[PDB]
Amino acid sequence: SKAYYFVKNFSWAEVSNLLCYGTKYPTVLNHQQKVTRLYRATLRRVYAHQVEGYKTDFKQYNENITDIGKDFNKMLALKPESLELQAYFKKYEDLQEELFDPAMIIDESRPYAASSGRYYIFDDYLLKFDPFGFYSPKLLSENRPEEAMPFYEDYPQNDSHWNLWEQFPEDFEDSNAEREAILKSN
Amino acid sequence: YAPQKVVLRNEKSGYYANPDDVARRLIRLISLHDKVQNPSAITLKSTWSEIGVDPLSYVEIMLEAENEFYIELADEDLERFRTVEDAVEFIARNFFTN
Amino acid sequence: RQNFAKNITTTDIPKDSHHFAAKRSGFTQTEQAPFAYNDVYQYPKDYKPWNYNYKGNGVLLALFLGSAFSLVAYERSYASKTGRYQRKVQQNYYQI
Amino acid sequence: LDFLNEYPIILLTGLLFLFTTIFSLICLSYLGLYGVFILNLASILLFWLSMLYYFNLIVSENYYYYISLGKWMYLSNGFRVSFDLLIDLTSISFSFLTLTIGVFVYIYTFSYFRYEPLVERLILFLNSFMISMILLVSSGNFIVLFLGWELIGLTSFFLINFWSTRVGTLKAAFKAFSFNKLSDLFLFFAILIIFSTTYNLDILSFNNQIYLYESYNIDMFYWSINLIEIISFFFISCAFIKSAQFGAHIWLPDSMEAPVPASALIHSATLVSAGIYLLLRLSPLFELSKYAYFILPLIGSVTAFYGGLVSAFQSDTKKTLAYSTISHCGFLMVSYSTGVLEFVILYLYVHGFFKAATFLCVGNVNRFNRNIQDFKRMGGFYKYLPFECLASFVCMINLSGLPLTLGFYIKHLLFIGLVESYTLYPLIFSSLILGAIAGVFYSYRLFYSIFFDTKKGKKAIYLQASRIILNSKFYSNTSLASNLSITFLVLISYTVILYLYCTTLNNYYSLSDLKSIYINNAYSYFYKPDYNFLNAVSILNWFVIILLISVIYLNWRWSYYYTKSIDSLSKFILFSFFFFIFSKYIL
Amino acid sequence: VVGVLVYIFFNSVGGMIIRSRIKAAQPNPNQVKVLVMPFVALGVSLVISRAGINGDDFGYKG
Amino acid sequence: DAYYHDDTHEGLMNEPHGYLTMDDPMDLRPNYEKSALELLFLVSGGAILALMLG
Amino acid sequence: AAPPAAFFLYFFVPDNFPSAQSGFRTASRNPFQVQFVFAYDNWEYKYCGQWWSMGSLAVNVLFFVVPLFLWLILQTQSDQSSNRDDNSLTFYFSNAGFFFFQIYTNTG
Amino acid sequence: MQNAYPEITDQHREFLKKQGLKVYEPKPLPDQINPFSKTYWITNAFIIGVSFLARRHALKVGAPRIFWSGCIVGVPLAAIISRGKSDQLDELVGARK
Amino acid sequence: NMWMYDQVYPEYVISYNEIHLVDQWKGLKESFSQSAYWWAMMAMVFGFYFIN
Amino acid sequence: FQKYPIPRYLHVGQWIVNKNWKWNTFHMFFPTAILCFMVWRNSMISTAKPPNYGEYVDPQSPVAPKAIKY
């Protein structure tokens, strides 16, 4: 579950909805979905305050969770239009608000946790990339021409265009040997 | 040392935790519950309703499951679990599962 | 687009041909014709892509000669500034 | 040797440290993990040894040095400034503390980040920050001081936001960046005013001719403002931003996501002390200032109270340490307002050493808890981190200012010299008293909740750290190097603090000259105290005793030992009464 | 101009490996020339300028 | 630690690698931008040394 | 919100030479990102006088009257400089037109 | 320039030296720090030689050698600065021209 | 520029952990209402020390 | 964190160990020390110091502070 409660410009109503239910819009959830989500949120908060707390009392925690379980079992069997169910929703949303902590412990496995996204993972596209051929062999042809295509050189990584004319070794013998040979022949 | 050659990522079996270990721990935790009648009938193909796990006991068990596996599960993921196999695969494929 | 020639005349391109062997035999009735050239680049085996592979002394020699010329030119300028043919060295020097 | 006394080697060793750091940053491919570690360790050890040799000469004897590297920049028509360093008592007091804490943090930083992919980057960033701070405190003129001021802000922006792949840490770093830009503006405007007045940037000269401009005024568009008042206002503003006083403190708690060695350096001396250094660097100016006289004690006491009380309520270990640092910065501001410059140095050294050690212990605990810094998910860690438990106990009893510890004396000295002539004295004194008693609360909470509570953490930590196959002579939940670093840091801290106490608090005054001519009668109540003062300090002593009784004997939960706890409290009260009677009247 | 032209035309023959191969194939006097003489030209220009800015012909020495 | 693996056994421990510059080590182009910029640096340094210091 | 269907894109002059650095590999763009890229340039006001109240009227008025405030503050500080005989805000003429470091030589 | 300090008598300084006090006097630079002495340039030559040899060894072994190169240029580049600033007539706290 | 843009986890430029206070005015009201306790405790401490 | 592959073409510094780090450390440390020694030797020319214990500054000596004749 993404823990973006405070890193988005949310109002309290949106944050309260996200804390009580796994969505900003609880009106699109079924009755059973709403009851189960509220029960899970309440149990999570009670555990975060009465088991992982400051001076934790296990006996009191057991009493409170037993009472909450009884109440939510009553809640599940009610009808959505009943006012008693609405009162129960209001009571447990108030309980969630009253135990709200600006310093919530966020599990490190959640998407927007404190230590999430600390490392950039390289995919296979970057791993197999080698323009120059030191790590992976590079053809002098620079590519394999597929059929139905002309054979064209790959675009270089550096398109400088700051080049001279072709360089030749000094005293390079470049006479028209073929033409001279044929003209001598006839 | 890295071989100084192009090496791609290795997916291996796709499980970051032992599936058998995850399944055994999860089934033991399920059997720890009061409304579960017999541990010997639980199977990876068993549905939560078969072993007698109503939605409230389901959320109770899945909270202790995320406590026991050092992870935390979203509401939608838990809602998509139909059998023990689905939860076992989801937990075993989690990168943070310990 | 680039239009320069790649078959240079100054030197031969370092390459090997054992990699990427051609088939040349045992063809079926459906597969494509084999490729022609298959040669690949060969690196000097002492090349480090992560640093300059510079083993010369020209840059260091040029900078050292420039610095030495600067020193001797300053000595000449100071001697000329004091109206002397060479620097008169005092027997004791103190902190500025 | 007389050659060493006449020509310091501190410059050579510091240059070696700086150049090794820079070249390791540039040539990081040639040096692996081990190469960078070894090279920078050698350089930092040589620097520390040289500065340790010169520490005694500068502190006890009247040795100081003015080094010029050469003419640097033209700042006016026909005017040039040089790169000047002033190695005197004020500079060495900060530089030695920074270097010692940095050496031990450097050794600890390899064990921390043990298998992280970017240990070299963190090591080099810590070295850069330490170098910048040492250059800042050794300034000879105002331009070098501004350079150090801008360097510490820049290098701390990179220790923060070390996890550069996250924009969440980028926001936290940018907060401090904006506050540092404001600090730079204030400091540079103050320097401009100083240069427009006296036409010099040398600090020493400024400290000796500013009294000639006390009766001067400057013309703002509709105001005639005293020169000393406006200069002191700007200096105090930038110092307040750097030292994280009330209001301008909000950047500091958000700076806690940096790695814990960076937090150990930043929050113990260095950055938070920088503002204090400024007050110590320009003492005559603030001695002749009405704005300082009114604003230092009030803001200092408010900051002390605020930080002390907020710290006692924190659950994150790093947040607790950060708010304790804020409270101690306020206490340092009040101690400077006292008018005794020795007490400021003693407070600085004690707090810096023990706060750095506490950060190191907390960092090991946090690493064990797998990056969960809230002790609501800890408990029963004594058997898994025993060295951390015991060293942390020592460091917290010293840091909290408990009776019969080294940290008690700085609080006592602060309360000896407090001036009672302020108009807002009741608020200042109440804030100071409430902030003094807050150390016991957060020290006890941190220690007890981390080490000696019920198991509130996840089962995975405890059960994976206790498998049978792991039983060996090599078994440990930390590194041996971390334990050695913390042990030697504590030993060196004790030695240095005892030496300073002997130098300043003995009957024979041995400290070198502080170059200040404002002398008050504060030492009299230290040398020849009277009865009412002793009774007044006894009042606070008994308040602390009551608070200790409260934190020890209060039961906030049901337990099998509740009745026996009440019985033990009654037994302790009766035994204390009878023991007092026997020790006072009969035998 | 001579120094910069010779420098450019001697160090602009290809990539690092190609340049290394060409230099290795070069005979010793050719390598000596392509190293030394651009430096000689540029340094002689600088020396002429320095002699231009210094008055060392003044006869009131001693 | 309990199950530490040394650098030789660790297959994901890297040695220095990577191209320093985007320029092709086996480029066959008579490129002169690099030479021009080195000329700029070297001539500026030489002009500083031979004209300005002393 | 549905992705935009019509928005301002990038455009190039006819017969433009494409940029082919690093192998010349161009990816498909994000409609929302391109929309943001070109939104501000093409934004315009809808009716006369809409600017004054757009945002904060007091803040907009203060921004509008900034140059007058600067001029008035400069005038006040010029009053301060006049009685203290400080540098006034005038084009000082003390070099008689001789430039800063200018060669003044003759021929013949 | 002037004296800028109140006057003192010769009898008083005679009494001071009888009491065991000594008049402060600037000290000459030692041979190692003197940029005009012979030991200075012997050290410079030793530095240049060892730098050249270690540069050759670093090239052979594959270590960086640009830092050994900076020592070679550093010697004549720092001789200019050390001797150049001694020629200037500006007065620091050290001694009076 | 009111958002820290990112291809992974974009964020708002300012974080608000104390969002249970909806706005700054109710925040100021709550802060003063709760700081009255600290004011009272400081007054008691000063009264003790002024008497004795 | 668990190790993950880094592309070969990137000149980045994640999990890098140089096997020849001892010689590189030597050849980066000692010339650095020599350069710093030269800098310190140059800087000691412009270093000041107060008079030692048992010494006093004669106010009429040339080294004593001076005023300006107008």
Ligand SMILES: COC1=C(OC)C(=O)C(C/C=C(\C)CC/C=C(/C)CC/C=C(\C)CC/C=C(/C)CC/C=C(\C)CC/C=C(\C)CC/C=C(\C)CC/C=C(\C)CC/C=C(/C)CCC=C(C)C)=C(C)C1=O
């Ligand atoms: C507990 O803090 C607080 C914080 O944390 C420091 C906070 O973050 C915040 C939150 C703040 C914000 C969100 C922004 C607001 C910005 C601010 C700058 C507000 C900061 C508020 C404070 C620092 C609190 C200070 C205010 C009060 C009212 C403190 C109350 C102190 C007392 C009651 C002490 C008792 C004093 C007495 C009894 C004086 C009586 C006099 C005598 C008995 C005679 C003897 C005295 C003399 C001879 C000299 C003294 C005479 C006078 C006239 C001076 C007295 C004046 C005083 C103010 C004492 C708040 C509200 C806060 O509240």
Ligand SMILES: CCCCCCCCCCCCCCCCCC(=O)OC[C@H](COP(=O)([O-])OCC[N+](C)(C)C)OC(=O)CCCCCCCCCCCCCCCCC
């Ligand atoms: C004239 C005197 C006026 C005195 C005014 C009242 C002063 C009270 C003491 C100072 C303020 C303390 C505020 C709380 C700080 C700690 C908060 C915290 O985290 O608590 C949890 C800590 C540790 O517990 P915990 O964190 O493990 O969990 C406990 C459970 N919760 C979280 C719900 C609290 O517990 C305590 O602090 C216990 C309560 C302390 C009560 C102190 C009563 C003092 C009584 C007055 C004595 C006066 C003596 C004479 C003085 C003469 C000189 C003035």
